């Protein structure tokens, strides 16, 4: 396999299905990436993550740089070796969690300094973020950008997008200057601009001029609501280069994924299925359920009637109800495995339906049942 | 397979190795039984418990009767079906945890009434305990006894042992009157008498007159220290019928197990490897380690150099150190799997060494290294 190659096998409207080939493996798109925080997908061995159908996982740079430390992970042989996942890993830049979780935050054109949420002092910059992602041994490296809050005024969205594009060029140059990283990993840029079409366009043009292996739509899933998110995707995704993957960062709920694929998105991540699995929320084709509800206490059916996962093969709603109510670790294990398996089955249905030219019908059928 | 048959294949001094055959499976002795509290061996799927080598698990009646409830479990098809473990299960009587965890405790010759640790009111008696164990679908049912605290005066140890023997007869009669239980499960009696040889003898004689499928040594591992425990086993175990299994309740540390087998014990349980696994304590042939210690932060070796478990095949001390320090669920999963696998490897070495007439040498070699 090559360092990076994205092939599109089939299309339907704006939707695409295909493959990303990388040295560590093939990624089927559209793809869902389970989130590994601190070098673990919560409550799952890597073999179980793979058994659910995942081709790639996401690792959080911020958490890793705090515990166990990026230099330490590099000394120990890299993130893949450390956690026992040998397939591709996409790392985020660390910037988002600096803003959402850290304490200091002195921001500047150079980057950000901050206090860990033991109050030790740390720094991130385009250069240091790219370096940390190298030390982790990331396969897909995210450019370091500045968070644009929602809502944002046009002036502030513009200023922040402009800074992010300067940081995208610095990220590109840092990545390219490190021969081992340039030859073995891929680099994605992040489109900014809040909800403003003109700023989204300027951002896409700047990122395409620099040139990346893939393009994320940043700044969404931050409070805006689905209608607004879809409205922004409607004009934003077509601005990105068609022949590279489009990654919607932090999305999301099953219905958000379906609509985003309808709008040209190829890659997804979110904590939702893992975090909400822990935590009683289980996804089903008839919509989510909360397994803690008393109505499930004697329900012998599996979490979902059709799901092919090992949890649905082997245990009842009644048992999982009991485990989650009792605070048992096995409850978190089982809920997380089922929810990430459900997400992968959703992605497989999306891929097959695009391949077969019946994705619009699938989306309609999916929604009719999920919201019945 | 029969309802119950204990065969002794080989002996060395007081030590024995053999098999218990029951309808749901064969148990190799000496046996270690991982403890399932509330219908789960903490942080492990039943398939993983089996992969470590366990032939039988213990279920805690007290916890089960509170959550999810014994009648509910029976409605749902029994404990085996509910939790997904199809091999034998030994249930305790519930009495111990009434004393250690519950709030009310009004004790009488009839039994005990108590408040749950939501303050709902419950009762246990020989008859109700046997009934609850039936409703759970237990394969090995423990007679309901009275807890003798350590230390105990001779008068109080005698009074309590005498009550326990009256309750042993009531347990026997309750079990025998329920045809389905009598035909499919086994019943063990519990020897009492604190540290007093004469009381231990009276207790053994009373239990043998009633007649049980197996005999537990109760009332130890309660604060007495290893020398005293071994001193009591020295005279107590030979009092029990030789041709039935001898079960030392609540023991214990690897060295306690080796010495107890030297003294004629065939069956063991304890929370130690699971609870202490969570929790940073890992067993090794060179003695226990605490994986949280900073000295392990960059240690690429497995938990134990010889252990054949999947954790030692796949992950380093450094990774598990990180997970436990970070409070990650996967840390509990990995530590628990390794510790229960270590216990099963200990039992296998004990069985093979007795079978080969070299158990005394094994015990000496084991101690020399474990305490080096
Ligand atoms: Zn499932
Ligand atoms: Zn091991």
Residue numbers in the entry:
A (entry chain A), B (entry chain A): 11 to 127, 129 to 383
What does the paper say about this structure?
In order to investigate the importance of Gly232 and Val161 in human Tgt for queuine recognition, we created a doubly mutated variant of the Z. mobilis enzyme in which the corresponding Val233 and Cys158 were exchanged by glycine and valine, respectively. To allow the interpretation of the obtained data at a structural level, we determined the crystal structures of the mutated Tgt variants created in this study in their apo-forms as well as in complex with preQ1 and queuine. The crystal structures of Tgt(Cys158Val) and Tgt(Cys158Val/Val233Gly), each in complex with preQ1, reveal, compared to the corresponding apo-forms, a shift of Val158 towards the ligand. In contrast, this side chain is excellently defined in the electron density maps of apo- and preQ1-bound Tgt(Cys158Val) and Tgt(Cys158Val/Val233Gly).
Transfer RNA–guanine transglycosylase (Tgt, EC 2.4.2.29) catalyses the exchange of a specific guanine base in tRNA molecules by a substituted 7-deazaguanine. The reaction follows a ping-pong mechanism including a covalent Tgt⋅tRNA intermediate.
